[PDB]
Every structure is written in C-alpha cells, then in structure tokens.
Design a protein around this nucleic acid. Structure first.
Lengths: 147, 244, 490
DNA sequence: GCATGCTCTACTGCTTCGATATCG
DNA sequence: AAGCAGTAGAGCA
DNA sequence: TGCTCTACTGCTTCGATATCG
DNA sequence: AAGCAGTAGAGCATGC
C-alpha cells in the first residue's frame, strides 16, 4: 500500500515522456490521500508518522527533485494541500518532524511561481506556527531570517 | 529648427530643400521627482537592482555575467550585442529620395500611419531650386498624381516609405510628408456583411428617426447669402485641457 | 476558436525513381522536396510559431510506427517547429544526403496502400488539443502508384473517404517528373506544380487577432450601443531582448529595491512621496494625487454633434486610425441601430463627431466617425468590411508655426516636361510586398546563429531606388529640365 | 425545532499576452 | 541612452 | 580686431520599462 | 481581452 506507492512515485519521477508521469503523479498522490485515511488503529498511524518522512525515498525529496520544472503543478500542489491536513488529522506526533517542513514550504514557495502553489503551502506554515505555540522550537525555526 | 536636406530625381535633380514639422502629439515636459517624506530633500534615495539568478536558494551576482539572449522556435539563442552591432543593417545615410509615382490617387485615408506630419517647404537662398520645386508641385496639381518618397532622418532611424501630398495654398505652396505601412504592419480579417443580412434590416420609420436626429443634431449648414459653409462647434480650435 | 492551432503532416514518396536522378542531370526531386520542407519550417518558425508540424517518409525499407506496419517510417512527432528538427532533417540534402538516407533507412520497397493514411489518422488522434486545420502535404511524382491491382485502389479510395469524413484534407504538392503539367490523369477521387508560396513569399509575417477595447457609445443619456474597437494597422517590431546568465545559460530573474535614506535600511511604497520643482518653490503630493489630477470621465463614447464629410482636410491627422464594429454584448438590436445609422450616415454623407475616453482613467479625446461600406466581388474579393472608422483630431499645440512668409512664382515652361516625366515613371501602386529591411535582416541574422550555416544570408531590400535603371528609362532630358530657364552657374 | 447532510450555478479571481504610456 | 548642428571661449595672427 | 579649433547646449532622434485591459 | 477554474452560498430532502 504505502512505500510500494512511494517507490511507484519514485519510478514515476525517474521514467520518460513526462506527461504520463504527470497523470501517474496526480492519481498516485490522490490515491495515497485515500489509502492513508482509512486508518483508525494506533499501529499503522504510529508507523505512518515515520513512514512519510525518510531521506532516501520521501515526500520532501520528491518535492525538491521535481521543483526545477514548469510541468508538475497539480501533483506537488496536491501533496502540499495534503500535508496541511496531515497536521490536523494527526496531532503532535510531528513534533520534531517540522523544521524540515518549514524549510520545505519556504523552498517551494520561494522557487515555484504559480499562486495556486503558494496558497496551500502558506496555509500550512501558518497552521504549523499556530499549533506549535508551545514552549520549544521557536528558536529552532530561524525567525531572524523568516522575518 | 530650419531643416536642410536635398531631394533627388533619378541621376541629378539635386534640389536643396528645407523641411519643418507640423501637427504632432503634444507631451508635457516636467517629470515627477520621487522624494522621501519628512525630510524635503531628494538625495535620500539610492535605488538598486540585483540580477539575481536564484532559481533555488538565492544567489546574487554582479553585473559582468549577462548575455542578451533571444528566443527562437522553442528555445533561447545566445549572442548579445557587439556582434549584432556589427551584423545589423547598415543604413548608408539619410535620404529624401523619390521611388516612383502614380497618377491614380490610390493612397487613401485609412493607411497613413505615422505619428507626425512633415511640411517639406522649398529652398532658401538663391531659390532656383525652390522655383523648380514649385514647378514640380504646379505639375502635380493638375491631376490626382501622387508621389512615393523614401525618408531617413539620420543613420539611426530606420528608413521609411511615405506619400508626399501637394499643398496649393494662398501665400505658401508646400508639400506634406506622411508615412506609410510596410508589409508586416497590415492584417486583413473577414467581418460579416450588413447589407445582405437577412436578420438585422431596419424599418423606414426607424430610418426617418435617424434622419430627424441628424437634421436636428447637424452642425454644418450654409448661410450668409452666398451659401458657403458655416460650421457649429469646430473641434480644432480648443486649447488642450490636460495641461490646463 | 481563438486559441486554436493548425496541423500539417509532410508525407514523402521516396520510392523508385524519385530517388533516381530521373536520368536527368538538371534537378533532383528528393533534394527539391527536402528544400521545400526546410523552407516551410524556416518560415513558420518565426511566422506562426505554435502550429503542429510532422515529417513522415513512406515506401522506406525499414519501419517505425506505433501500430507496427511495414515500409512506413515516421520520423518526428506533432509539435512546434524546432531548431533541432531542422538541424536533424537537413542531413538528407544532395547526393551525400542520398547516400546517408540510404545507409540510415534505405530506399525502395513495395510501398503501402490505405495503411499510410491509417498512420496519419493515428498521428492526429493522439493530440488532445483543438485542431482547426487538418492538411496533408504529399510530395509524390507517380500518378498511378497501384496501376496493377484494383483492390488496393478501391481500399485506398475508401480509406481516403473515411479520412475526408472526419475532417482531414490533403493537397499533394506536385513534383515535376514531366516538368510541365501534362499529367492530366484521373486523380479526382482523393483530392479536394506551383511551389512559389512554399518557396519564397513569407519571410517576415505574423498571425494574431484581438479586440483592444470594448466600449459603449451613448447618444443622449439613455440610448447606449456597444462597439468593439478593433485595430487594423499595428506597427509590428522586434521581440524583447531576454536576459541570460553566462555559464548556466538561463534567465536572470532580476529584482529591485530602494533604500539609503542617509541611514541605509530599506523602504516601502508609503514612506516616499511625489514631487516637482518650479523655479524656486517645491510641490509634494501622493501617488494617488498625481494619478487623480488627470481624471475626467468614464470609459466610452459620447455623441457630440454631426458633420458632413467636407470640412476635414487630410492635412489633419495625428495617430493611426482604429475601426469600430457592432458587437453583441448589449442587446440583439444594437447591430440593427448601427445598420440604420450606417445607411443614413453613408447616403447623406454625414460623419459622427464624438468624445472618446479609452479606459478607466484617461483624459477625453475628440474623434470623428466616418462610415465604410464593404466591397466584395464575384471571386470574393473581400477588401473592405462594413463598419465605422475613427479619425483623430488635433487640439492646440499640435499645430506649430513655420517661418512660412515666402511666396515666389515660377514660369510655365516646365509643366509639360514634368507631365511627361511623371508619365514615364508611372506604375500602378501596390497591394503588398514592401517589406522591412531592419526586421528582415534581423530575421536572417538570427537564422545565422542557431542554424549557423555560413554568414548573414540574403538581404535584398525592396525600398531602394535604382538610379542606373532610372537614367536610361528617363532619357537625356535631365539636362534640359535642369537648365531650360534656370542656370545655377556657381 | 431548528440541527444536519447534500447539490447546482453566478461572482471572484488566474494567467497569458498584446497594447500603451512613459522613462531614459 | 546616444548623436547633432548652431553658439560661443579663447588659441592663433 | 580677424580667423578657427573647440567646448557647449538646447534639441532632437531613438531604446528599454512598468501599466493595464 | 480571452479563456479557465474554483467555490460560496443559497436551495433540495431527512434527523436528537
């Protein structure tokens, strides 16, 4: 289900003729958004909060590897719409998994061009600084640059 | 400013000529100097621009990097300027030459297409050239014969074609230069016909309503017992309201 | 439709004697077809640079097609005109190209039938866009290619009928196997020679159509009509100079800011004001203040009287002239009021006078509306559309003053000579073809970088006088017109 | 009783791009 | 930004 | 004072830059 | 201007 679809997304990146890669990316992200949400058990949820975040094959890596492109908007933008509700479908099992989210959203905002790819990816960062009004991590997000 | 040039026909009809301008678009000369508030001096602004190739986390570069690239087909092609300054069009000097003629006055009103009009007057100073030019326009007067004349201001300006209309008036006999289109600056496009249109034909009482509106809103009628025309509201003598 | 695109497939018959020299040492039809295809691409890569252009050779020895037939080799796919496509394709020029095509694909086979038209239909069907023109350019010389088997003839005319059904049309640009058009054969079953359009005639054009403003003309206060203000003579010029980085070969994406207020820092739109100086005293204002001091009216046309077509002298003009037409976003009937107004203004030769405010905040301007009745003919010589036309009119400091106090009379010994001279130089005007030297040589000079053949290519300019052909055509009356009455005599 | 769930179309805005005024 | 022809400041006689 | 190199100078042409439907 | 796309929000049917 998941990580098989993630390597299906990786082979969606690394293939040829980048229009079928666009169809596969859009349908795979909007199918992942369904195969994640049919959970009610703590087991796969506790697994997913580390399953969606890895370094060798991941959603951050997938966003940044297809970011120098004028082709792929309706897939990466769907990922960024989906992580704003990742922050609310789950609570604070993302507590150290958010500084790279800050830099992910700042990169995807300051490098891409379309406005529909800058509205959900700035809904997200505002939602994150809203939910983490707790003690730590406000020094760990670099405010003196983010201002 | 007195304009000296020289008109040619064929090999040698070298008429020393004076040109002057005429009606043109008027522009206001003063400009809005941007100052900063609460100081009332100008020097507190030092604008900058950086030619910042980011495309990533930001990299800000100095000047000495810039190739003026053009677009071709589906890509960008290089080679900025000294090469285009060499392999541009050589303009070989100014000219007020004559290309050809036409007895048929077939330069009509809806093709004039310039932003100025140039009164090419006459010679001065031993005006054998000017009496020759008045002979030329006194030959062009008798029939509807037009003159196609090629102009350049200087080496900088692109050369241009234009029409030289004759002007036979009371104390001055002049020629007036207007521009003309090159065959990139047209386009023709099919619009639907309104005579043989089976849907949008009007009624005669509607037509007479139009005619009553015209003859009640007319501004030009002949009077003063010699039946020369007097016009109400001559829309040429107004001062400009914008600078006022 | 407005965002519609057109499509063209080049189907090349390089089979039997077309690859031969026809035993003629004068011209070769393969190199002629590839020259014509290169001319089409090399014009439409700056003329109409968004259509779809494909190249397909048939009768070849190998095969390359997605239904996997035999003898049929598609080469490229439906896309833009590209420098890569022409630099790839020009490897088949001459006998060196004949041998390179021989070793690359080969030549000669029992060529296809209906199946190549099936390949064209499966090439057009893939494209997900709005095709508006569906044409096939066939480069062939034989004119009974299946003159020994009638089943293939019947199936080929059947498949061509089913290609005509869905909206595909072919125009075979005839190569010259007999030179003159003596093949008066029976190829009427498929179709719906002259090559000069494909050869020369379009080195610098464009294609476009917009409307530039949709305004409304109000007569009294309540009678409104809706007109689209088209533009018909537009002064095309050279495209903008894109900026580019040296090493990575990419655009630069500049940015711009404002600071150094005798402190440094960084500024905003609000901290700074607009200003002027007039001799000794200085004015300061806001940006809304300097944008609101030129504020008169609302966008549209305002009827301010009537006049017949006799006072306006064509000494008087200021700008180009637009063209107003009865559009369809007020009511079904504004066309009818415009048609009645058209008929009356034309037959009583009267012209409207209006004030005209172009968009949301511009000072008003006086225009004069002159009617125009259409002209078409038997063969549809649609030279004029029916509708009204703006002429602009000057105000005050447009008309300057000359020195102007000079009036000398000449002698009438020159008028007959000059009448003979202007009857010697008489040519009937033009319809087209007076193209632009600067833009033209810029086109050729940009060809000579990404195509990089030798040098700047041909650069003739059809706006120069030919004094050498003027002298003999005029004759030796230049001296008598120079000194019949008047010597300069130094 | 209003507390909820569900569905189709006009108001707002997006994006390209052609023109236009304007600065240098 | 980049020429351009009258208008003079002062070298040369 | 009489002549000319030259040191301006208002004065125009064009080329690039936001503004906007 | 030319076109697309979303969606906010008022209008169809059944609920502690």
């Amino acid at each position: 289900g998941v990580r098989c679809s993630l390597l299906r997304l990786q082979e969606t990146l690394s293939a040829a003729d980048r229009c079928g890669a666009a169809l596969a990316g859009h349908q795979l992200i909007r199918g992942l958004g369904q195969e994640c949400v049919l959970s009610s058990s703590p087991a796969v949820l506790a697994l997913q909060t580390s399953l969606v975040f890895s370094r060798d094959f991941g959603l951050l890596v997938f966003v940044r590897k297809s970011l120098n492109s004028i082709e792929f908007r309706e897939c990466r933008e769907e990922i960024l719409k989906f992580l704003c509700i990742f922050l609310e479908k789950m609570g604070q099992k993302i507590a150290p998994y958010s500084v790279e989210i800050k830099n992910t959203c700042t990169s995807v905002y300051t490098k891409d061009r379309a406005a529909k790819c800058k509205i959900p990816a700035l809904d997200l960062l505002i939602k994150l600084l809203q939910t983490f009004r707790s003690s730590r991590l406000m020094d760990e997000f670099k405010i003196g640059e983010l201002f | 400013i007195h304009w000296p040039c020289r008109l040619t026909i064929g090999s040698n009809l070298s008429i020393r000529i004076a040109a002057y301008k005429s009606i043109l678009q008027e522009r206001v000369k003063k400009t809005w100097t941007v100052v900063d508030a609460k100081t009332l001096k100008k020097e507190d602004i030092q604008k900058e621009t950086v030619y910042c190739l980011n495309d990533d986390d930001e990299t800000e570069v100095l000047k000495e990097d810039i190739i003026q690239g053009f677009r071709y087909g589906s890509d960008i092609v290089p080679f900025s300027k000294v090469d285009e300054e060499q392999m541009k069009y050589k303009s070989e000097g100014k000219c007020f030459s004559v290309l050809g003629f036409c007895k048929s006055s077939q330069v009509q009103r809806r093709f004039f297409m310039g932003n100025q009009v140039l009164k090419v007057f006459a010679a001065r100073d031993d005006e054998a050239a000017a009496v020759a030019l008045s002979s030329l326009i006194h030959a062009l007067d008798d029939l509807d014969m037009v003159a196609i004349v090629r102009y350049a201001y200087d080496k900088r300006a692109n050369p241009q074609v234009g029409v030289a209309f004759p002007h036979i008036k009371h104390n001055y006999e002049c020629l007036v230069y207007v521009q003309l289109p090159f065959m990139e600056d047209l386009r023709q496009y099919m619009f639907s016909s309104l005579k043989n249109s089976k849907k949008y034909a009007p009624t005669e009482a509607q037509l007479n309503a139009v005619d009553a509106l015209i003859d009640s809103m007319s501004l030009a009628k002949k009077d003063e017992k010699t039946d020369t025309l007097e016009d109400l509201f001559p829309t040429t003598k107004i001062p400009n309201p914008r600078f006022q | 439709k407005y965002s519609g695109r057109d499509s063209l497939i080049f189907l090349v018959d390089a089979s039997k004697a077309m690859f031969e020299s026809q035993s003629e040492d004068e011209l070769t039809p393969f190199d002629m077809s590839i020259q014509c295809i290169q001319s089409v691409y090399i014009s439409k890569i700056i003329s109409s640079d968004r259509d779809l252009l494909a190249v397909v050779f048939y009768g070849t020895e190998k095969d390359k097609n997605s239904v996997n037939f035999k003898n049929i080799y598609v080469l490229q796919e439906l896309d833009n005109p590209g420098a890569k496509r022409i630099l790839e394709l020009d490897q088949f020029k001459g006998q060196q190209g004949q041998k390179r095509f021989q070793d690359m694909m080969g030549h000669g086979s029992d060529y296809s039938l209906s199946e190549v038209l099936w390949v064209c239909a499966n090439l057009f069907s893939d494209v997900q866009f709005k095709m508006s023109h569906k044409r096939i350019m066939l480069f062939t010389n034989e004119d009974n290619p299946h003159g020994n088997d009638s089943a293939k003839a019947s199936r080929a005319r059947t498949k061509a009928g089913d290609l005509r059904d869905t909206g595909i049309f072919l125009d075979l640009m005839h190569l010259k196997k007999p030179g003159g058009f003596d093949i008066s054969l029976f190829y009427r079953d498929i179709i719906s020679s002259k090559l000069e359009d494909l050869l020369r005639k379009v080195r610098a054009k464009e294609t476009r159509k917009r409307a530039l403003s949709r305004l409304k003309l109000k007569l009294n206060k309540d009678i409104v009509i809706s007109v689209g203000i088209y533009n018909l003579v537009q002064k095309a010029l050279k495209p903008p100079p894109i900026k580019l980085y040296r090493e990575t070969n990419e655009p630069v994406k500049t940015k711009t800011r404002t600071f150094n207020t005798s402190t440094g820092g960084l500024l905003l739109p609000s901290d700074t004001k607009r200003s002027q100086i007039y001799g000794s005293r200085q004015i300061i204002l806001e940006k809304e203040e300097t944008e609101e001091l030129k504020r008169f009216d609302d966008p549209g046309l305002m009827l301010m009287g009537f006049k017949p077509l006799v006072l306006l002298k064509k000494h008087h003009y200021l700008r180009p002239s637009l063209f107003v037409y009865p559009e369809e976003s007020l009511v079904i009937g504004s066309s009818t009021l415009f048609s009645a107004l058209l008929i009356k203004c034309l037959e009583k030769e009267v012209a409207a006078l209006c004030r005209y405010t172009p968009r949301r905040n511009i000072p008003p301007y006086f225009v004069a509306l002159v009617p125009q009745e259409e002209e078409l003919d038997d063969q549809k010589i649609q030279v004029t559309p029916p509708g009204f036309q703006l002429v602009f009119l000057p105000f005050a400091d447009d008309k300057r003053k000359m020195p102007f106090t000079e009036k000398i009379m000449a002698t009438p010994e020159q008028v007959g000579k000059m009448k003979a001279i202007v009857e010697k130089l008489r040519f009937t005007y033009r319809s087209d073809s007076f193209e632009n030297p600067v833009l033209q040589q810029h086109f050729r000079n940009l060809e000579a970088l990404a195509l990089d053949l030798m040098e700047p290519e041909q650069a003739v300019d059809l706006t120069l006088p030919k004094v050498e052909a003027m002298n003999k055509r005029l004759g030796s009356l230049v001296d008598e017109f120079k000194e019949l009455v008047y010597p300069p005599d130094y």
